[PDB]
Design a protein around this ligand. Structure first.
Ligand SMILES: Nc1ncnc2c1ncn2[C@@H]1O[C@H](CSCC[C@H](N)C(=O)O)[C@@H](O)[C@H]1O
Length: 251
């Protein structure tokens, strides 16, 4: 698809608009002093505007513009360019490819409840590092691990913008134990993997430590309940949003 970028406002260009539709324009977007006309392909136009084919970049970039703050009491997730006039705790997460998922939200909310200032936290499957950052904002000391190294520079970049500095490390539970035990572990994964890690979870946490598990589809919540009960944990709390569930356990 091609874009015909013109300078001016819609109100301003309103005259020559009719001619763009004739020329077969199927879309028009006023974007910061410029009017963008969309065509399947370039045509001949006396408007002396510039042509350019639309790419993924442009989409994401456009997606980036429609992005709105996300509430997750006591936090608000924001784009480095967002402005918030509230009393909620700000989290700035560059929309990069590595915080609007229902599970992240349940995680944040649960973290605020189970995290105490001075707690050592393990963000298992840190991704953007958002939860990691959140824990520091609550006064905790955190470690973020992920088997995917691709995400680690972004996470650290994110921490930076949030004026906080968690420890980030490529790996999984095992990569983490040397920095434990921890007071709390927060894991946004999936029901079956939790079920398999249940036993290693209790070894990562000091007695009384907390385990916050999310990324759980409602229809698979039973697997975690059983895995955790058997791993010796005790249920503490349950939260859901859509088809997603978060389960809180105490060791
Ligand atoms: N076994 C494993 N150990 C560590 N990270 C894992 C893992 N399996 C998947 N992941 C990582 O899990 C992350 C899940 S999504 C990241 C979500 C973020 N912590 C939040 O709360 O929203 C991904 O970044 C993925 O790379």
């Amino acid at each position: 698809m091609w874009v015909y970028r013109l300078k001016g406002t819609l109100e301003a260009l309103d005259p020559i608009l009719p001619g763009l539709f004739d020329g077969g324009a199927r879309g028009l977007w006023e974007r910061e002093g410029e009017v963008w006309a969309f065509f399947p392909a370039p045509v001949d136009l006396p408007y002396e505007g510039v042509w350019e084919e639309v790419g993924d970049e442009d989409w994401l970039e456009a997606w980036r513009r429609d992005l709105k703050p996300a509430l997750a009491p006591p936090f608000v997730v924001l784009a480095p360019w967002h402005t918030w006039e509230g009393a909620e705790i700000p989290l700035v997460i560059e929309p990069g490819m590595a915080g609007h998922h229902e599970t992240t939200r349940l995680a944040l909310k649960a973290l605020a409840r189970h995290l105490r200032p001075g707690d050592k936290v393990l963000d298992l499957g840190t991704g953007s590092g958002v939860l990691a950052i959140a824990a520091e904002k609550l006064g905790g000391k955190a470690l973020g691990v992920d088997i995917d190294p691709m995400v680690l520079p972004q996470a650290e970049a994110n921490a930076k913008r949030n004026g906080v500095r968690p420890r980030f490390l490529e790996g999984s539970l095992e990569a983490a134990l040397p920095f434990g035990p921890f007071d709390l572990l927060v894991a946004n994964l999936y029901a079956e993997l939790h079920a398999a890690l249940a036993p290693r979870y209790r070894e990562a946490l000091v007695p009384g430590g907390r385990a916050l598990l999310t990324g759980i589809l409602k229809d698979r919540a039973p697997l975690v309940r059983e895995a955790m009960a058997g791993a010796g944990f005790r249920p503490l709390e349950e939260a859901a949003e859509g088809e997603w569930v978060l389960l809180a356990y105490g060791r």
